[PDB]
Structure formats: structure tokens, C-alpha cells
């Protein structure tokens, strides 16, 4: 489509006007409402305008991008209270959201690649500009050099596919099939880094911690899903070779999910534990993607949609304790039930959404993902039970130790909870239970 | 200017005497006087006064719009049974009306607009056969449906197509 | 404000062993008369033994510690309101500065209490300037 | 501060909402407008739109066509579900000498 793109393009001059910070998120929620209205999509590409079109996977990912960026302007009031550069922050957020909409509504592989690697420069700018740590240089360089080092040979793979086929469109490239090892490694390993593996994760827990709240939303909300969207577009023509080489990645992802779930029990930071928590769920997503079933692909799309909300909502919760208690340390964050009792509703409602929860879309994504992985092999029942047990062994630890117990002595006086924060964590959880209603929307993209 | 703390400076007052173990290791008599003054300060004689501004700010006009006639019902019964015995019969009138409204709406929905063969998302009701004992009409009884098309029809046998 | 010192005397060690032995004896024998009879028996066992020297007392103190570790009850009786009990610190009292973060309309419900708190704030800041200032 | 100052609070001592910390006018406007663009547009009117959304996916049409097809297939009685994509007489299979050593997958 072009309406949303030109809406953000004409929302670009809102940044240069003084005292215009809160109108931009109003117009962003308005264009999210308009994007809720334009929902006539089926499994093929619809609303074809030049090189821009949309199917159901692209619809869900653009809607998630708009919701995460609209809440990202709502979460960052620390940028508005200080005289930190609001115009540059708004311009970077609008440009980054426009690049995410352009790389998700891309009809072809190459424009997807171009806006996909254009998206990492505003994330770089947010991490090195608006963070609160001395190691922001260690944060952005790890992210950029990891993704760039594994995504440069993907361009050689992309033009090898173009030279063998002729076209760049997803449907015409779905017809062909390749039997090459190095083409498979080029077109897969960039997404295998962009979603967290066990071995290649390092950029993730050292880039989530040192970023701002907005870097945390944009990294754990939609930029762990660029790799998932890319693998959902690439795996269709590399089925024979991924069936040869998928047991290595699935075994590494499952053992790495168990091991990173064992890491989070030995983590002393709130923002680092959610950073490693993004590794464990996307390990289940990666293990269910390579089985190529209908249920694996549908449950992977459902779990990426339901994870981009819940991980970002958990990252807003660690920010509103970092703003008041002064540190992200888990030892300091103790007994917040007696400090902010009304926040503890949103802590447990968004920590339960990280595990299997009764009304959330995360359970409907996790059920449809464990179906495919148990269907893939019977040996995976040993390590899926361990991973899904350790997931709530660590995820209950963050709510339990931060929101229950004796109070941390020697804490100075801070402000109380605000209606903006309650609204911010309201919109990270009510989409998770209102989307099981009309769940055939957000699951059946095929 | 925006004051989050109401215009007064926030600080601790009772000090180190709030812990039970710090109370027992030793007290200077000025700390004994401070703890006694804090315990006499923490007592309250009368209850909280009914601030009308809290009721004004903590109630939207829609809430007053849909709670006005039951408030009139509670106010016209206020001198008859007192405040406590009239708010109870006011609160169990509107809640009973809501319960009967929900019962009537659910009854209307599950017996007049249940799930049929033209829609997936409705509530698809399946009923079992009632037990027939003698004294009922037609005790020699077999299963009425026997065809495979009669099972789980969801109103397909009355389709116009 | 006397912070306790970590050195423990030998008489303090045998007094702590006597206290823990009678607490274990109270845990083992629930009836008060049988516990009293066994407590007088254990007191006579200690009182026949207090006339020895220091090194023999240290070695037999270690033997008594090993014996008390051997005969320790699986469910020792403890007071509920004290530390380590069944219902220790069931409620956690937050510090009073959150009372300073109430709404003024919420502060209007206890205006005499908040006026007394605002009066006590000046006394506390002069007391803190006297003590640590 | 005294007892009558807390009993009647000053209107200038106002507790801010989360949106602005400079003046009271920008708090109320941004609070009411942000609650307008999220709750009564993106969660209630949008959910009402998505409740009465038409058959974008053809799941209702699939159920109606399945009921009509199961009405008509068991009347003919050939197959409730057809196992073959095309007719077995229409497909021209290659001969055994034509294939040679080719990987036949089943």
C-alpha cells in the first residue's frame, strides 16, 4: 500500500515543529486504526501498488510494527521531560517505522533486503544516542558488525538466485528449487543471526542492556522478527537442502534454549534476563520453522506476533523500575508490591504472557509450535519438556524476586506510578488476549 | 510547575527504629522519645472524612449517568432503613437486574442464534439423547436419527440450496 | 546502640549448647512434666561436669556439640512470632515517605495526621543536623 | 503547613499525569486524546470492525462448500475425499525405459 507510507512521509515534518511530541503518537495510533480498517487480505499478495503489496504475514508484521512504534513513543517520556533531542528522536522513530513498513510490504527479496539493512542504522542511532550506559559503543558495534558480517554474503546469494531465476518476486522464486550448500548458508545464516541462536546471540544481551527503552522495544519487538520473516520467505525454495541441514540448527536451538533458560536463573539484571528470555522463545520459533509443516509455520508466525508484544511489555516494566530505583540490578529490585502495588498486576500479566498463559496468543503459538517439533522427532519430547519447564522456572523468578519479599533498604524517595505507564502496559497485554478472538487472522497466513 | 509530592518535601521520619533488631541492640533516650512520639502520631482518633473532590475526580460522567436512577432509589429509601440497609438493597437490585439481563441475553443467543452450517464462529451445541423410562410417552423407543447425514447437521437438512 | 561482638567465650559456648540442648529436649518431649524431669536430668548432667579443666572442657564441648547434632529433632519447636518461626514477618511495612507521595485530595482525608507529620519533619531535620550534620 | 491547608487543598498544588510536567493544560489534552486514539478507536471500534469483518479468508465458504460437497459426493458415492489430484486415465505416466535410473519418491 501507499497510504500508510505517504502518511508517515507527511508525518515527517511534525518533528521540526516545537511542542509537537505528543501529536505524533496520536497520529501513529490513528494510522494504526486505519491499518486495522484495511484488512481485506488473503494468503496471496493484495493491494498491489508498484513494488508494494501485502499478504497476511505482512499485514500482521506491519500492524505489530505500528503498534510497537506507537507504544515506543508512549514509553519514552524521559526524552520529553529532559531537553534531549525530541525532533531527532521523532524523526528517527518515523524513519525506522517507515523502513519497517517498507521491508515488510516488499513484494520482492531485494527491496526487503535493502530496507532490512536500512533499518539497522536508526537502531544504531537510538542505541548510541539515547542510552544511559558507558558501553553503548560495545552495544551498537556488536549488533552492526554481527548482522553486517553475516548479511553481506546474503547479497551474493540473492543475486545468484536472481541470475539463476531471472525475477525478484516471492511467488516466481517459490516455483524454483536449489540444491547448493553455500546458497543455503548465505540465504539462511543472516536470518539465523537476526533471530537469536545459541551460538550467534552475543549481540542480543549486550545490545538490549545498554540501549534505551525504545531500543529495547525496537529490538525485542520487531527486529527479532525480520529474520523470521526472511526465513519464511526464503525456506520455500530451499526445502531439499534445509531438510539435509536442519537437524543441526534445530538441535542447536533446542539445547541452546535449555541452556539459555539455565542462564536466566543466574542473571542479576532485569533488562538482561528479558534479553536472554527473547533467546529461548525464538529458539522454539527457529526449531518449529525448519520442520516446514503447516502447523510449524503458522505457530511460528503466531509466536513471533505474540512475542513482539510481551517482550516489549516486559522491557517497559524494567524501565519503570530503572527510572525510580536508579539501577537495573535484581538485588535492588525487591519488594515492589509494597512500592507499586498497582504495577504488580501488569508485571504478572506480562510475565505470565512470556510463559504459557490461559488467555494469551503466546500459548496458541506455543501449542502449534510444539505440535510440529514433537511431530518432527520423538527425541524432542525430552528436551521440549525441559525447555518449557525451565521457561517458567526462570520467568517466574523475575516477577518473584522483583515483586515479592522484603524491601531493599537504603532506597531514596521516588515518584509513584502514572496513568501513562498504566496505559502503556495496558496496550501490551490487551492485544495479547483480544487476538485469540479472530485468531484465524493472525495464524493462517497460508 | 508540576509537583508529584503535593508540594511538601518527602523524607523518612521514624529513622532506624522501624527494624525490630535495631530496636533491641540499644536505644538512646532521645530515640526512645522519638519512637514514643511516632507511635502516638500513628494513632488516629476519627475516620477519614468524605472528600467530595475524590468522588468527583474518581467517577466519570457516564458512571453517574448510568447510576443516577438507582441512586434516586437509594436516596428515597435513605430515611426508611438507614444508610447501610438501603445501599444493600440498592446494590442487590442493579446486580440482580444485570444477572437477569445476562441470563435473558444468553438464553436468547443460545436458542435463537446458535451456530449453523453457514458460520464457523458460533457456539455449536450438541445434545445427547434423553433417558426414557416407563411413564413417559413412547417408552418403546429407538434412535430417531440413523442416517449419516442426520448426525451433526447443524441445520443443513433445512437448507434452501 | 551496642552492635554485638563476634567473639564467643567458652562459657558462652557451653551456655549456648545448654540452651540448644534444652530446646531440642523440649521439641522431643512435648509434655511439660516429662520435659521438666528430663531438663533436671540434663542440668544434673551439666552440674556434675563443670569442675573439669579447660582443654578437657573444650574437647567435651565438641563431643557435646556432636551429640546434639546427632540427636537433633527433624521438626524442632520454635516460636512463631520470632525469627525462623512459622509466621515470621508475614506483613512488610513500607517506609513512611510514600505517605508524602499521596494525592492532596487523598491527603485531605487525614489532615490532622498530615499536619502533625509536617510538624515532625522539622524536628527530624534538626535532629539529623544535630546527629550527623 | 497547618491543618486547614491540608483540609482544603490548593488548586495550584496539582499532581501531574504521566504525559507532561510543565503545565496542567497539556496533561489533560494529551491524556484525553491518547485515551481516545487507543481505547475507543484501536480497541473498541477496531474490535467492532474486526468482529463484523467479511470472509477475507474463505473459512465460512469452505464450511458451506464442504457441507454441499458432502451432500453431493455421497449421493454419487464415489469418494468422500478424492485421493487423486487429477484423473488417473488423463495422466500420461512415463515408461520404465523412459525413466531409467531416476529417484522415485514415496
Amino acid at each position: 500500500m501507499l497510504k500508510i507510507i505517504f502518511f508517515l512521509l507527511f508525518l515527517i515534518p511534525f518533528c521540526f515543529i516545537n511542542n509537537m511530541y505528543w501529536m505524533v503518537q496520536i497520529m501513529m495510533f490513528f494510522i494504526s486504526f486505519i491499518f486495522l480498517l484495511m484488512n481485506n487480505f488473503m494468503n496471496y499478495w493484495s493491494e498491489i501498488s508498484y513494488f508494494l503489496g501485502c499478504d497476511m504475514l505482512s499485514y500482521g508484521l506491519i500492524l505489530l510494527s505500528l503498534w510497537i512504534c506507537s507504544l515506543m513513543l508512549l514509553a519514552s517520556e524521559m526524552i520529553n521531560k529532559h531537553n534531549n533531542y525530541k525532533n531527532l528522536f521523532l524523526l528517527n522513530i518515523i524513519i525506522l517505522l517507515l523502513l519497517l513498513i517498507l521491508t515488510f510490504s516488499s513484494m520482492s527479496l531485494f527491496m526487503f533486503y535493502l530496507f532490512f539493512e536500512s533499518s539497522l542504522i536508526p537502531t544504531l542511532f537510538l542505541i548510541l544516542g539515547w542510552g544511559y550506559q558507558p558501553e553503548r559503543l560495545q552495544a551498537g558495534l556488536y549488533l552492526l558488525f554481527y548482522t553486517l558480517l553475516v548479511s553481506l554474503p546474503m547479497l551474493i546469494g540473492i543475486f545468484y538466485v536472481m541470475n539463476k531465476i531471472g525475477s525478484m518476486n516471492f511467488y516466481l522464486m517459490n516455483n524454483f528449487m536449489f540444491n547448493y550448500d553455500l546458497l543455503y548458508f548465505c540465504l539462511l545464516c543472516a536470518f539465523l543471526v537476526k533471530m537469536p541462536m545459541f551460538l550467534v546471540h552475543l549481540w542480543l544481551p549486550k545490545a538490549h542492556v545498554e540501549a534505551p527503552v525504545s531500543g529495547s522495544m525496537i529490538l525485542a519487538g520487531i527486529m527479532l522478527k525480520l529474520g523470521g520473516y526472511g526465513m519464511l520467505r526464503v525456506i520455500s525454495f530451499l526445502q531439499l537442502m534445509n531438510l539435509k541441514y536442519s537437524f543441526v540448527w534445530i538441535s542447536i536451538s533446542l539445547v541452546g534454549g535449555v541452556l539459555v533458560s539455565l542462564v536466566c536463573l543466574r542473571q542479576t539484571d532485569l533488562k538482561a534476563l528479558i534479553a536472554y528470555s527473547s533467546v529461548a522463545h525464538m529458539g522454539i520459533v527457529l526449531s518449529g520453522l525448519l520442520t516446514m509443516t503447516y502447523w510449524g509455520l503458522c505457530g511460528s508466525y503466531t509466536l513471533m506476533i505474540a512475542h513482539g508484544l510481551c517482550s516489549s511489555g516486559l522491557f517497559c516494566l524494567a524501565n519503570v523500575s530503572y527510572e525510580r530505583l536508579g539501577s537495573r540490578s535484581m538485588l535492588i529490585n525487591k519488594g515492589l508490591l509494597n512500592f507499586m502495588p498497582s504495577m504488580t498486576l501488569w508485571w504478572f500479566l506480562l510475565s505470565s504472557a512470556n510463559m504459557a498463559a490461559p488467555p494469551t496468543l503466546n500459548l496458541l503459538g506455543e501449542i502449534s509450535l510444539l505440535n510440529s517439533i514433537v511431530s518432527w522427532s520423538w527425541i524432542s519430547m525430552i528436551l521440549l519438556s525441559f525447555l518449557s519447564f525451565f521457561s517458567a522456572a526462570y520467568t517466574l523468578y523475575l516477577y518473584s524476586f522483583s515483586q515479592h519479599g522484603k524491601l531493599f533498604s537504603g532506597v531514596y524517595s521516588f515518584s509513584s506510578g502514572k496513568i501513562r505507564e498504566y496505559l502503556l502496559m495496558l496496550l501490551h497485554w490487551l492485544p495479547l488476549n483480544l487476538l485469540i478472538l479472530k485468531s484465524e487472522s493472525f495464524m493462517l497466513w497460508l | 510547575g508540576a509537583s508529584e509530592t503535593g508540594g511538601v518535601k518527602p523524607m523518612v521520619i521514624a529513622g532506624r527504629m522501624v527494624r525490630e533488631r535495631e530496636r533491641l541492640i540499644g536505644m538512646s533516650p532521645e530515640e526512645r522519645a522519638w519512637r514514643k512520639q511516632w507511635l502516638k502520631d500513628q494513632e488516629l482518633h476519627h475516620g477519614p472524612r468524605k472528600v467530595p473532590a475524590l468522588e468527583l475526580e474518581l467517577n466519570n460522567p457516564i458512571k453517574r449517568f448510568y447510576r443516577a436512577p438507582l441512586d434516586k432509589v437509594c436516596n428515597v429509601l435513605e430515611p426508611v432503613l438507614g444508610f447501610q440497609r438501603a445501599y444493600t438493597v440498592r446494590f442487590w437490585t442493579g446486580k440482580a437486574l444485570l444477572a437477569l439481563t445476562g441470563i435473558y441475553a444468553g438464553a436468547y443467543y443460545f436458542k435463537y442464534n446458535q451456530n449453523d452450517w453457514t458460520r464457523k464462529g458460533g457456539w455449536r451445541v450438541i445434545h445427547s439423547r434423553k433417558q426414557c423410562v416407563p411413564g413417559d410417552e413412547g417408552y418403546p423407543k429407538v434412535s430417531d436419527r440413523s442416517a449419516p447425514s442426520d448426525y451433526a447437521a447443524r441445520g443443513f437438512n433445512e437448507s434452501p440450496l | 546502640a551496642q552492635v554485638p561482638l563476634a567473639i564467643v567465650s567458652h562459657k558462652r559456648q557451653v551456655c549456648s549448647l545448654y540452651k540448644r540442648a534444652l530446646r531440642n529436649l523440649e521439641s522431643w518431649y512435648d509434655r511439660r512434666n516429662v520435659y521438666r524431669y528430663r531438663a533436671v536430668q540434663l542440668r544434673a548432667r551439666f552440674d556434675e561436669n563443670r569442675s573439669k579443666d579447660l582443654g578437657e572442657g573444650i574437647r567435651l564441648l565438641a563431643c557435646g556439640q556432636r551429640e546434639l547434632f546427632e540427636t537433633r529433632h527433624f521438626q524442632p519447636r520454635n516460636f512463631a512470632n520470632s525469627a525462623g518461626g512459622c509466621a515470621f514477618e508475614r506483613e512488610v511495612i513500607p517506609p513512611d515517605w510514600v505517605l508524602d507521595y499521596w494525592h492532596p485530595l487523598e491527603k485531605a482525608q487525614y489532615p490532622e495526621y498530615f499536619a502533625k507529620r509536617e510538624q515532625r519533619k522539622k524536628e527530624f531535620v534538626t535532629w539529623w543536623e544535630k546527629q550527623y550534620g | 503547613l497547618t491543618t486547614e491547608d491540608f483540609a482544603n487543598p490548593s488548586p495550584k498544588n496539582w499532581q501531574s499525569y504521566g504525559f507532561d510536567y510543565k503545565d496542567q493544560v497539556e496533561d489533560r489534552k494529551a491524556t484525553k486524546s491518547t485515551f481516545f486514539v487507543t481505547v475507543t478507536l484501536c480497541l473498541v471500534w477496531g474490535s467492532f470492525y474486526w468482529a463484523y469483518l467479511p470472509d477475507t479468508q474463505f473459512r465460512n465458504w469452505a464450511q458451506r462448500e464442504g457441507f454441499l460437497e458432502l451432500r453431493r459426493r455421497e449421493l454419487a458415492g464415489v469418494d468422500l475425499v478424492s485421493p487423486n489430484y487429477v484423473d488417473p486415465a488423463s495422466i500420461t505416466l512415463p515408461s520404465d525405459e523412459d525413466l531409467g535410473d531416476t529417484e522415485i519418491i514415496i
Binding site: 496513568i419 | 494513632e43 474518581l58 | 513512611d96 | -
Partner: peptide, 19 residues
């Protein structure tokens, strides 16, 4: 009647009424 030391619940109630 001792006065319990509770944090402020005005903002949560105003959020509930606005919602």
C-alpha cells in the same frame, strides 16, 4: 485506629475511571 503506611492509589483509580 492505627494509620497503615500505604502508597498512593489515586493514579490507578483515575486510570481505571478514565479507561
Amino acid at each position: 485506629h492505627q494509620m497503615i503506611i500505604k502508597p498512593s492509589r489515586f493514579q490507578w483509580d483515575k486510570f481505571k475511571d478514565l479507561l
